[PDB]
Every structure is written in C-alpha cells, then in structure tokens.
Design a binder for this molecule. Structure first.
Ligand code: LS5
Length: 281
C-alpha cells in the first residue's frame, strides 16, 4: 500500500474498494483492490493468479500485509455499463454486441473448465479496451472469500445453495438482452420482485419445465401463475438466431441451460468479427 500512489477511487465492489493506482517501483498503472484474513481465502485467491486467458482481467499480485489484503489487477479504461450509457441514443451495433458476447463466452468456457465460477456477473464487471477486447473482472473471488439482483439466476433466488456454472450463463443472457434493447431485462428491487419479474416474462416454472423446482427451499405453492411471453416481444429487434441462443441461455432448468462451450458453436456466431469500438476516454 506504500508502494502505490492511489490516483482515483474507481469504485466499491462486493469484496472491496478498487482504485486506479500507479506502482512506484515500476510506474505501471494497475487496478488495486483492497479486500474488505482466513487461510482458505489466501489459497483460493492464489489459484486465481495462475488463471490466465485473454478475456480474463489478470490478477497480478496478492498482498497480505499487516493483516490486510490487497489485490493488484491489470487495468482497463472503461466498463460496459459506461459504454452502454454512452451508446444509449444509438445503441451498440449488432456486430459489436456479437463480438463482445463471443469473447465473454470464451472467457467463461475457460473459467468453467477450471471449475471457477464468477457468480456475480453484471455490466460493471465487464471491461473494454480500445482494441475491441472485453474482459471479465472478479472471477473467482466469490469462492475464495444496495446490491443489484438483476442478473441473478432463478435457482439462487429459490434457495439452491450448491449452484453451478449455469448461473453465469443466465447472468450473461440477461446482459445480452440489455445490450440489444438498451433496457435492463429483469430490474427487480428486492428478491421477490426479482423472482416475479422473471416469472411474468418467462412464465411461472413448474415440474414440467423444471423438475424438482417445487421442492426448492424457498418455493411457495402460493406463487402466482403467469404465462410465458413471446421472446419476439421481449427482445426486439434481435433476429431468430439471436433469440434462439437467448432462449437457451435463459432456460429455467440449470441442466438444460446452454453451456458456454456449446454456445460458442451456435449459428449466431457464424458471422462474428472483431470490430473496434469508438471509446471516449
Ligand atoms: N470511472 C472511470 N474513471 N471510468 S469507468 O467508469 O469507465 C471505469 C474505468 C475503469 C474501471 N476498471 C475496473 C477494474 C480494472 O481496471 N481492473 C479490475 C479488476 C478487478 C475489479 C475492477 C477492475 C472501471 C470503470
């Protein structure tokens, strides 16, 4: 903490405050994260350091000093939330949405193959650079260690404590929809509002569509029954390839919901390219 000249506070996270900081000895600009320490956690984090991929924001150093923890990460200039806001009036071009989504699925497919889950994907954890790359931040901190419930998967909301990599697919599906319509898909303001927002669009799940759902911890027989809506009405004007992919990412049953690896082979990515965005830094 003495070797860093904190420039600005980049924002608070689920596990701590992040600062844009400049390393004194090296001059390099990094993202320093002060974790808000157990032995398990240290080991957890230390595995994440060796998890390298072009679509994962790199964990550079871990500093446990004076019984405090700080994580040093590579720095990217803008998050997807700010870029979306900037493009609110015109929307993000489909060719760019398609490239960002393809890159994110590659990152997830890498993490998921190493049994690492993000568990808290949101536009704010997605970082972009001038070269057209997009990277995931916070990967693996959930395991080792007002909040937005907008991108939370149904199984978490219903009390499943042993969730899987499918939760990340769901969150990504929610971000995919938001980039296309320029409006949050399920903006719930509490857990039950969140749940009901999902039920009102996708229909209240039952044993036909989701076997075992009625035996979930927080499922109540008293849940109102809503019918399912046409996706054509939910995500206009996404073409049929996009909508079919989206429906596979938003399946209720985690076991049925598409994997990141299978998603990469979907017809929607037949014409992917890597356009370079216009970023105002
Ligand atoms: N607020 C500013 N300055 N611009 S911005 O809002 O687009 C913005 C700019 C940079 C970042 N970067 C965040 C991060 C970064 O670079 N690496 C990380 C690793 C872990 C957690 C967060 C980060 C996040 C937001």
């Amino acid at each position: 903490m003495e070797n860093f000249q904190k420039v600005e506070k980049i924002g608070e996270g689920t596990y701590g405050v992040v600062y844009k900081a400049r390393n004194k000895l090296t001059g390099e600009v990094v993202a320093l994260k002060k974790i808000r320490v157990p032995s398990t956690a240290i080991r957890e984090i230390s595995l994440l350091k060796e998890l390298n991929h072009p679509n994962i924001v790199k964990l550079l150093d871990v500093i446990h000093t004076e019984n405090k923890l700080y994580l040093v990460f590579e720095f990217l200039h803008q998050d997807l939330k700010k870029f979306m806001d900037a493009s609110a009036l015109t929307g993000i071009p489909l060719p760019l949405i398609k490239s960002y989504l393809f890159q994110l699925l590659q990152g997830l497919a890498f993490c998921h193959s190493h049994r690492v889950l993000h568990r808290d994907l949101k536009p704010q954890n997605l970082l972009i650079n001038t070269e057209g790359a997009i990277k995931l931040a916070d990967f693996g901190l959930a395991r080792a260690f007002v909040v937005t419930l907008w991108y939370r998967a149904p199984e978490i909301l219903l009390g499943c404590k042993y969730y899987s990599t499918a939760v990340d697919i769901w969150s990504l599906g929610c971000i995919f929809a938001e980039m296309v319509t320029r409006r949050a898909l399920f903006p719930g303001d509490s857990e039950i509002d969140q749940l009901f927002r999902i039920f009102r669009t996708l229909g209240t799940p039952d044993e036909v569509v989701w076997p075992g759902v009625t035996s979930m911890p927080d499922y109540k027989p008293s849940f109102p029954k809503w019918a399912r809506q046409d996706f054509s009405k939910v995500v206009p004007p996404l073409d049929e390839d996009g909508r079919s992919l989206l429906s596979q990412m938003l399946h209720y049953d985690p076991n049925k919901r598409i994997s990141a690896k299978a998603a990469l082979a979907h017809p929607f990515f037949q014409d992917v390219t890597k356009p370079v965005p216009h970023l105002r830094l």
